[PDB]
């Protein structure tokens, strides 16, 4: 998977 | 008596020119509130950016120790403490944040009680101590009165959407936020403006609006010097290039990685996406975490095995993962990999359904390309991405 974060 | 006061008193007797230098760095009109801050305990600047900008430029390497000491000594009933809570949350300084929350929940100022309660909800949500449904319930139970906490309650849920791979609610939540409604606290408005920007950047990244995505990430990078915002900004820019341009993608991930030095949590995000990038482009991969039990990490080991044409070893490792709880977005990749291994159209359709469910307009390209290779209508596949 791709990981994301803000 | 607070470490920073002692540090500044010490540096001031050695160098008289520091008053004017600190006055301009703190955005002050004249050196007076500085004198007050150094002498009368309890004095706090009108704007919290005053203390952060002094700390950042004068004691670059002692920020955490100095800031932790400042914050634990603050009167919880004041605008300063409310700003410190935002500062601590924005940087992910969880020890500072949890102790401010504890003392803000108990106190007798209504505004500080509200900030305490909402940030606790955000913290309990990031830690899995509650889920979205209790979060929403608790937010309403609070009957929020400030514009800020109203806004922060929207962002709170957006962060959860983001790590649960459920991207549909987020543009909807974004649209409910209006920053010009926050009036008293200038610092909090700035911090939020920056939080929104990376949030917005993610929203566009998932909507496959790649130019706007980089616009907002860069906007954040330009105006901040807080490590957390740098990290996620670069993370995002790099993901925006994962499918278009290998070198641009690698370079942003490496820039971000340098900004993450000595914070293992932030480093992990980059290692993961560098893993994916190199697997996807079929380059040699120094980034794979071979002994993590995390679903995203096992997926990388499988994707590598697929590139080394070890289809039998890959299939066994993939069956082991069907056992495990995954979100909709993770199932997206799962079924994509099942497809590359098995060459079944079925696996790819599932992959498209999951990326649709989670509304990841970015990753959907992969199984779509694969379906086009196996003879499915190309016009119809174009309409699916519209």
Residue numbers in the entry:
A (entry chain C): 1 to 6
B (entry chain A): 1 to 386
Give the text the authors published on this PDB structure:
The arbitrium system is employed by phages of the SPbeta family to communicate with their progeny during infection to decide either to follow the lytic or the lysogenic cycle. The system is controlled by a peptide, AimP, that binds to the regulator AimR, inhibiting its DNA-binding activity and expression of aimX. AimR is a transcription factor that in its apo peptide-free form promotes aimX expression. In this study, we deepen our understanding of the system by solving the structure of an additional AimR that shows chimerical characteristics with the SPβ receptor.
The AimR-AimPKat asymmetric unit contains two AimR molecules arranged as a dimer, with one AimPKat bound to the TPR domain of each AimRKat protomer. The dimeric organisation in solution for the AimR-AimPKat complex was confirmed by SEC-MALS. Having the structures of AimRKat in its apo and AimPKat-bound conformations, we not only analysed the mechanism of peptide action but also whether it corresponds to any of the two alternative mechanisms proposed for AimRSPβ. This comparison showed that the peptide induces a closure movement of AimR protomer, produced by a ~15° relative rotation in the TPRN-ter subdomain (calculated with Dyndom15). Further, due to the reduced proximity of the subdomains, new interactions are produced between TPRN-ter and TPRC-ter that tie the protomer in the compact conformation. The distance between the DNA recognition helices (α3) in the AimR-AimPKat dimer is only 60 Å, a reduction of more than 20 Å in comparison to the apo AimRKat form. This separation between the two DBDs and their relative disposition is too small to allow them to interact with the two palindromic sequences present in the AimR operator which are separated ∼85 Å due to the 25 bp spacer, as confirmed by the superimposition of AimRKat and AimR-AimPKat in the structure of AimRSPβ bound to its DNA operator. In the AimR-AimPKat structure, the peptide binds to the concave side of the channel formed by the TPR-like repeats, and it establishes hydrophilic interactions at both N- and C-terminal ends, anchoring AimPKat in an extended conformation. The AimPKat N-terminal is bound to AimRKat Q299 and E300 side chains (TPR7) by a hydrogen bond and a salt bridge, respectively. AimRKat has an Asn at position 273 (N273) that anchors AimPKat V3 by interacting with its N and O backbone.
